[PDB]
Amino acid sequence: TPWSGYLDDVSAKFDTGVDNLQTQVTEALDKLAAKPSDPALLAAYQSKLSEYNLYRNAQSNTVKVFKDIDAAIIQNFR
Amino acid sequence: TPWSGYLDDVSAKFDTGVDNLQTQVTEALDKLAAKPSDPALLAAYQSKLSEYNLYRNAQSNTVKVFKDIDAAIIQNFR
Amino acid sequence: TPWSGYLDDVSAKFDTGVDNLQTQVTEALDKLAAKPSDPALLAAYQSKLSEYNLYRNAQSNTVKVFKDIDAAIIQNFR
Amino acid sequence: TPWSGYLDDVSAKFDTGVDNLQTQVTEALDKLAAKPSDPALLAAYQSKLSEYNLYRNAQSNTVKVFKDIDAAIIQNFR
Amino acid sequence: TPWSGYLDDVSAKFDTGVDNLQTQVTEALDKLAAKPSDPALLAAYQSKLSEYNLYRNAQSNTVKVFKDIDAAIIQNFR
Amino acid sequence: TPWSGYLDDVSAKFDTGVDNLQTQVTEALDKLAAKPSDPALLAAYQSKLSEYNLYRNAQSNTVKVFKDIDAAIIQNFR
Amino acid sequence: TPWSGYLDDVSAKFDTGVDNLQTQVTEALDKLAAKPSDPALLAAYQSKLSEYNLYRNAQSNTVKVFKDIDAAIIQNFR
Amino acid sequence: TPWSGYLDDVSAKFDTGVDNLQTQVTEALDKLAAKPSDPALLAAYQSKLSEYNLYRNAQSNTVKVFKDIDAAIIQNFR
Amino acid sequence: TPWSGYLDDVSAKFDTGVDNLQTQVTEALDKLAAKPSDPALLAAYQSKLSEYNLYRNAQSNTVKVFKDIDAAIIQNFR
Amino acid sequence: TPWSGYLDDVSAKFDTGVDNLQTQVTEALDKLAAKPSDPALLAAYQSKLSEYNLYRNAQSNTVKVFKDIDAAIIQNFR
Amino acid sequence: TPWSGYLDDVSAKFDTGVDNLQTQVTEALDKLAAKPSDPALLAAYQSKLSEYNLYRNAQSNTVKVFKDIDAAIIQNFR
Amino acid sequence: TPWSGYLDDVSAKFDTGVDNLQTQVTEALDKLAAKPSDPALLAAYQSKLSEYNLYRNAQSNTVKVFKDIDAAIIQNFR
Amino acid sequence: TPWSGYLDDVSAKFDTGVDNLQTQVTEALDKLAAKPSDPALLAAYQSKLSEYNLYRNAQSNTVKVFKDIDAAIIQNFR
């Protein structure tokens, strides 16, 4: 069984919170690269890329906060 | 179920806000290309093309604003 | 009873300080998406969107300041 | 009571600053479309349309300036 | 007696340094909104608005500098 | 009679040293939240918030120093 | 005493640099509108109108340059 | 084996997404330079050059976005 | 004796590096405002204004760099 | 006679090391607040403010070092 | 035999993890400097330079983390 | 021997990468200024000036990137 | 004989490691201040200033590390 800590479970909630955003970004890029002059494909790709940008930034900053909460408590043991 | 974020829902309101503007531009182009010397077809195509031009510009700039609002908040987590 | 801290009460003052700005932005977007070529609707939406932009930026930066004031005091306990 | 911010009040001064310019443009267009070969109607419509053009450009650029003034101050909080 | 700190006194020097710039911007806007096609009023308003823009930017950045000078000294107490 | 130690009297000098800074910060926030796009209100709130930030930091670090002076003397009793 | 900044003084040099160009344009228009078929009046009005056109364009662009010089310096404070 | 990172693979999808656009632009230029007064050659070259213009702009901006996503995560390691 | 630091001496080298550029810009503006339709005066003023623009930008950015070099060293004292 | 310790004498060397830097910063601010759009006044104030910033940081960190040297020796008495 | 610690072995995994990225950046720069107006060479160099930028940042931050883990353990010996 | 760092060697590759582009721009300007109405001289000067424009922009941005790579590593020493 | 410790000898290796970088920065500034619009002088000064910036940062951080190594050993005497 692969072990998962508390910081893993926080980062897992973003991964399960979006259904297939990792799939939808890759598929929208492949349709865009086939014909990069379609306004229907450009506006669709702008939405999914900007959505994926806010996805990783909210994920990585959240893990950073819970790390600093835990490190402040462990220091007060000794 | 295809997942849709908040930026998807903002861009979807422009898509549902016009009924068949993507259809009307394509149909007016096909009637124009059959006979590109009809003043009734030129004036009809000028209206629909200029309407489609303002459609994508208002859509793409609106998504850009809500991205910068969200990125300013996520930065203030840590 | 839902508990509310001091940082909740600071952020609540921005929420009660505007009456229905969350409503007015959504309603102005829906009227704009119905007809995105009306100058009366574009100028109305520019005002409410720029007002909503300054709303969240002043809110999020204010909470960040009071967090750093409190964290400086808690560090000087031990 | 409909809430109005500072940027709303700046844009409202242009709206109250002209009495019925939104009415006068629409009425001059309706008289022009009835008979678009009258020089008295063409010269009247040229004046009101060019007046309405300078109206929206001075309005929209003014709101853009006060937005950038406010965003520079809010950034210097934290 | 309303208390005023050192950062208040720095920001007060910009307020007393201009006599009635807050008045002159508001009065020039009201004369402009009455007739927004007068070149004498546009050129007068461009000067006062750009002057008011440099006013707040020089004020807010100056207060930010003296804050960081003081915070560096207070940290070296303990 | 509420008892007050020496560390209470040091912290009381900051409280009496400012007249109504706790009042002025709260009142400036309430005026800002009513209309968070007024440059006169943003620049006033930047001054009072940054003044309140230096207030608590100078207060809390000063009490920390006098604690460590006293604890060094009490250790040299036995 | 009406306060005048540096950008006011730059724009004032164009106003004092021409003696009565604002008067001469208005007077030449009034003589032209009385009899708009006089070649002596048309050629006189072409000269003064084209002179007034270069007047405002050189004035407004000059103020724009000194604004961008000042804004680049104020940014390098903090 | 030539190593290829993730940013290489994103830029490679635009290169494989078009078949021979780098060839078609060069060949259309060579046919145009032989006889630069043929309307069949001018209209063919306008299409391929404008297509190649949107090709590089969509490619270079996409790589810039994924760089800023990665740099935000690497900063939150320490 | 007026004291001058190292950052004063860096900024003084730009001031002594140009002989009378502050004079030449003011004199070219006064000759331009007397007759703002002379191509010999417009082309002379374009050269001196663009020269003065690069003067302040190179000056202010240079002082900003030496400030950040010094602040990095002073931090490594304690 | 006002008593002065060794840490007073170290901090006094910075005060006597600059002649009138406390005067020059205050005078440059008063000239700037009278006309905050003069590039000669902005560049002069950038130099003196950045000089005053490095002044207090080098002063306060130096006193912190000599405090920690003395506290390490006093601890080794008993 | 050249000795290699644990921090050397962590940094060595980035060096062996890329095959010839140090070679590919240098070769792409030499081809770019020969003709710095080729879009095929600019887009190739943007990819390799941005890849090399993320390479060193992920390497240097990783070594910093394992240093702080080890220093926390060594402190708890005595 | 004149010392040259790594950033000097990167900037030197652009200088040696072009043979005499600094010479060719100056010579094409001198031939153009002798007779600025020759289409053979205008089209030759457009090519060399636009080539020199891309030369300095690619040079200066490349040095900026390697500076930020080095500054990120030096920060992780202490 | 001027005494030199171990920390002096570490800082001396940076000073002897560059031949005349202190000279080359000062000479490039003097040539730049004579004519601050020469692209050959701007690009030369960008290279030497950025080289001098990395020089002091690598020097000052290195001395800080060897200080903390020595202070950890001296503490373990008693």
Numbering used by the authors:
A (entry chain Z), B (entry chain T), C (entry chain Y), D (entry chain S), E (entry chain X), F (entry chain d), ...: 3 to 80
Paper text:
The injectisome is a specialized bacterial organelle that utilizes a type III secretion system (T3SS) to translocate effector proteins from the bacterial cytosol directly into a eukaryotic host. Composed of >20 different proteins, the injectisome forms a syringe shaped nanomachine that spans both bacterial membranes and that of the infected host. The major structural unit of the injectisome is the basal body, composed of three highly oligomerized concentric rings spanning the bacterial inner membrane (IM) (PrgH and PrgK in the Salmonella enterica serovar Typhimurium SPI-1 T3SS)3–6 and outer membrane (OM)7 (InvG, a member of the secretin family of OM pores also found in the type II secretion system, type IV pili system, as well as the phage assembly system). To address this and further elucidate the structural basis for injectisome assembly and function, including that of the central needle component, we have conducted here a cryo-EM analysis of the assembled native needle complex resulting in 3D reconstructions of the IM and OM rings at resolutions permitting atomic model building (3.6 Å and 3.9 Å, respectively) and the 3D reconstruction of an isolated helical needle filament at 3.3 Å resolution.
Completing assembly, the helical needle filament—composed of early substrates PrgJ (the rod) and PrgI (the needle)—is secreted in a type III secretion (T3S) dependent manner and polymerizes on the periplasmic face of the export apparatus, extending into the cellular milieu. To further study the atomic details of the needle therefore, we isolated native filaments from assembled needle complexes and subjected them to cryo-EM analysis resulting in a reconstruction with helical averaging to 3.3 Å resolution with excellent density for side chains throughout allowing us to build a de novo model of PrgI lacking only the first two N-terminal residues. The PrgI monomer adopts a helix-turn-helix motif that polymerizes via an extensive network of interactions along both helices with surrounding subunits. The structure supports the solid-state NMR model of PrgI presented by Loquet et al. (Cα RMSD 1.5 Å over 78 residues), which was fundamentally different from prior low resolution cryo-EM derived models; however, some notable differences in the monomeric structure and helical packing, as well as the definition of the majority of side chain positions extend our understanding of the intra-subunit interactions and the internal channel passaged by effectors. The kinked loop in the N-terminal helix (residues 20–23) is more extended and forms a tighter interface with the N-terminus of monomer i + 6 while the C-terminal Arg80 has its side chain and carboxylate flipped, altering the interactions with monomers i −1, i –5, and i – 6.
